[PDB]
Structures are given as C-alpha cells and as structure tokens.
Amino acid sequence: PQITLWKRPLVSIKVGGQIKEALLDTGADDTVIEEIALPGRWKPKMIGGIGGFIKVRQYDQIIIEICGKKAIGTVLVGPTPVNIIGRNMLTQLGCTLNF
C-alpha cells in the first residue's frame, strides 16, 4: 500500500496466530509487541535508555504479516503503550519513505 500520514499509521498485523494493532514507526530501530506468546528461545534485552531502560524478551526469526505481506525478523515482547513496527521489520517488508 501507499500510506499517508494525516493519521497515525496504525495497521492490523498477524503474529503468533493472533491479530494485533501496531504503529508503523520509522523512528524505532526495533519491533516491540505487548502480550504475545511466541515460539523459540528468547533472551532478555534492555531497551530505551533515555530516562531508564525496560527489560523485554527478544525472539528472533518471527514471522509477521501486514497488508498481505510477510516479514521475518526479531520481535521484542514486553510492556509498550503502543505496539511498534520498527525499521528491522519495515526493511523486511520493503517499506520506504517517499516524498
């Protein structure tokens, strides 16, 4: 798709056999989703840094789908006010900024 930016770029995503809402965020390095059971071995990761860090669980090589397009990459699972699709997944989707 071509997504304009007059509203927050919230999308429905498929992940872990569930459906979640998430924000397409070019300002975020990583993808962070709250409250999802994922397969494989995880390891703790500290993210943030500005003001403090939050501990999350890092799962690698997870498949997500957005607007019919699949992407494989790392998903961090932990508390987040909004679920975030960061650049690690946007690159796998072939997503660009255009103006």
Next chain:
Amino acid sequence: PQITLWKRPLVSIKVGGQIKEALLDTGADDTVIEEIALPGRWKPKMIGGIGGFIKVRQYDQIIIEICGKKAIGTVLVGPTPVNIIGRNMLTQLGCTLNF
C-alpha cells in the same frame, strides 16, 4: 527521494536560517527541534505523557526545507535527544510509507 530504512532516516534540514540534522519519524505526531531561535509568538506546550511531560515552546507556521522541498507547520522547540520530523511536517512534504 525514496528513502530505505536500513539505517535511521536522518536528514539535513534548513530551519530558522540554520542547518540541523533530524529524524524522519512516522511514529511522532509533532516536530521537535532543540536549540533554534524562531520568529513569532510561541506558547508553552506539554508533550510526552508516558512517564511524565516535557515543556516546550510551540511556534506555528514555520518553514522548513528537506531534500529541496519546503514544508510549513508547527515546530516545537525544546530539549530532545534527537531532532524529530513528525507527521505534521511529513504530511506537508507529501511523504508516504510505501510497501
């Protein structure tokens, strides 16, 4: 331009007769720049909210230029770890996400 997302989408911008580096951030509603003198009447604005708020100065109808393209909109001036080009300016630039 067409900007891929393998690195942070940092750009050079012209604002206030200066040059600044800033991040094109689809996850941000607003544009926030540190340390720039801007014309007009400002008013304080509280931004953030997740964990606390930061006070900034809101200046309206400011002209910026990115990659040769001008855009007019609100610029918030205050402390920020990275200067942010948010959706209010990305929309004025005609910037979309494409995949």
